[PDB]
């Protein structure tokens, strides 16, 4: 799929190449640093909500491994020749980001439903529909970006089908949050509403990066998309995880879990 993405179309100045490489490496570092944080604070989370913080560890490592894979594919595919980085081997594509989403998006969705205090029948059915919608969004998007060079019209059609799933997923997420925030302890009924708007903002950056080929088909666009991915990843995975943990700890403390009370 490397020859299908716009990355394969351009030579890169040293500055452009090193910046992209440094974004990807910086990203590996932020995720594995947060992995340790989530690992260590899980002992301060009541059993009720401990899976939520554990799911963040899974998200961090999954995202960190992909970003680490990308950084090495990026340096494997290009060589500095005659004053610019030129494609040598067909080994880089964003398609692996989409495979990190198939597995990480369910994890991110499930930790939200856990701290909303859903359980039993409703948790199982709500997650199934959220995961089906999210996989439909991702799959249709993955097919679309296969055409970001050869057929932009087709990228837009698949993007619109993907956006329909996205809208429906957000309608479910939003409805559940607003119908269940009253059950939330420790005043986290107020915090959960900020998480909803963080998700809305951070998750909507991905379709924007998706569209870069249509409005900035050049080497600066490749840099820009990677920049947006980096901001979207840190906000949708790292910051979102920090807030889910804070909600887990706070509710734990309000529920009589002493380590949480000790920690907070
Ligand atoms: C057809 C493609 C998109 C529309 C599909 C809309 C139908 C989505 C079915 C899932 C649903 O709406 O149920 C969510 C509910 O809130 C969970 O308990
Ligand atoms: C592909 C082109 C078609 C694009 C179509 C754009 C439609 C925009 C509308 C909603 C977007 C989804 C945003 C969902 C916002 C939260 C919804 C919500 O919270 O629902 C409240 C509930 O009804 C009470 O509790
Ligand atoms: C790493 C975590 C998350 C939640 C990544 C989320 C990505 C999306 C919601 C992507 C959405 C897309 C849409 C709405 C339409 C264009 C294709 C995309 C897959 C980029
Ligand atoms: C635990 C401490 C924080 C996590 C440690 C992260 C360490 C370095 C990340 C390794 C990335 C090196 C490969 C990058 C490839 C490249 O530069 O192209
Ligand atoms: C075909 C796609 C189907 C997707 C179904 C998978 C979704 C399952 C949802 C919730 C599983 C329950 C996870 C356990 C909750 C934590 C238990 C605990 O806190 O002790
Ligand atoms: C790896 C498990 C993936 C699960 C697949 C089932 C998810 C159902 C979600 C929506 C299906 C959308 C079907 C689009 C197929 C056309 C794309 C193509 O031609 O390859
Ligand atoms: C639920 C499953 C959802 C199925 C996928 C929804 C519609 C996909 C429509 C896009 C197909 C465009 C094909 C264009 C072409 O290749 O010629
Ligand atoms: C990711 C969000 C999806 C956005 C869907 C956009 C809806 C369609 C908008 C206008 C379609 C115009 C198609 C013109 C492309 C002609 C092909 C070409 O010459 O490049
Ligand atoms: Cl978490
Ligand atoms: Cl993409």
TrEMBL record:
Membrane-spanning segments: 22-41, 53-75, 95-116, 123-143, 155-174, 195-215, 227-249
Pfam families: Bac_rhodopsin
Keyword Membrane: yes
InterPro entries cross-referenced by the UniProt entry: Arc/bac/fun_rhodopsins
GO biological process, one term: phototransduction
Location in the cell: Membrane
Alphabetical list of Gene3D superfamilies matching this protein: Rhodopsin 7-helix transmembrane proteins
SMART domains registered for this protein in UniProt: Bac_rhodopsin
Tree of life domain: Bacteria
Keywords for this protein: Chromophore, Membrane, Photoreceptor protein, Receptor, Retinal protein, Sensory transduction, Transmembrane, Transmembrane helix
Single GO term (MF): photoreceptor activity
Cellular compartments per GO CC: membrane
Membrane topology: Multi-pass membrane protein
Family indicated by similarity: Belongs to the archaeal/bacterial/fungal opsin family.
Name of the protein in question: Chloride pumping rhodopsin
């Amino acid at each position: 799929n490397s020859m299908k993405n716009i990355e394969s179309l351009f030579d890169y100045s040293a500055g452009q190449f090193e910046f992209i490489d440094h974004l990807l490496t910086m990203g590996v570092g932020v995720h594995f640093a947060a992995l340790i944080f989530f690992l260590v604070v899980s002992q301060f989370v009541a059993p009720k909500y401990r899976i939520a913080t554990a799911l963040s560890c899974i998200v961090m490592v999954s995202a960190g491994l992909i970003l680490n894979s990308q950084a090495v594919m990026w340096t494997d595919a290009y060589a500095y020749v005659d004053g610019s980085y030129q494609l040598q081997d067909l080994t880089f594509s964003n398609g692996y980001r989409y495979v990190n989403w198939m597995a990480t998006i369910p994890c991110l969705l499930l930790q939200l439903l856990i701290v909303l205090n859903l359980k039993g029948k409703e948790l199982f059915s709500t997650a199934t529909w959220l995961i089906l919608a999210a996989w439909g969004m991702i799959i249709t998007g993955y097919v679309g970006q296969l055409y970001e060079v050869d057929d932009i019209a087709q990228l837009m059609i698949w993007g619109a089908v993907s956006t329909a799933f996205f809208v429906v997923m957000n309608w479910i997420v939003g409805t559940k949050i607003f119908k269940n925030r009253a059950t939330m302890l420790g005043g986290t009924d107020s915090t959960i509403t900020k998480v909803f708007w963080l998700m809305m903002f951070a998750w909507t950056l991905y379709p924007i990066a998706y569209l870069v080929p249509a409005f900035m088909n050049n080497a600066d666009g490749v840099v820009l998309r990677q920049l947006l991915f980096t901001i979207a990843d840190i906000s949708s995975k790292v910051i979102y995880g920090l807030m889910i943990t804070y909600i887990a700890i706070q509710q734990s403390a309000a529920a009589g879990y002493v380590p949480a009370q000790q920690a907070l």
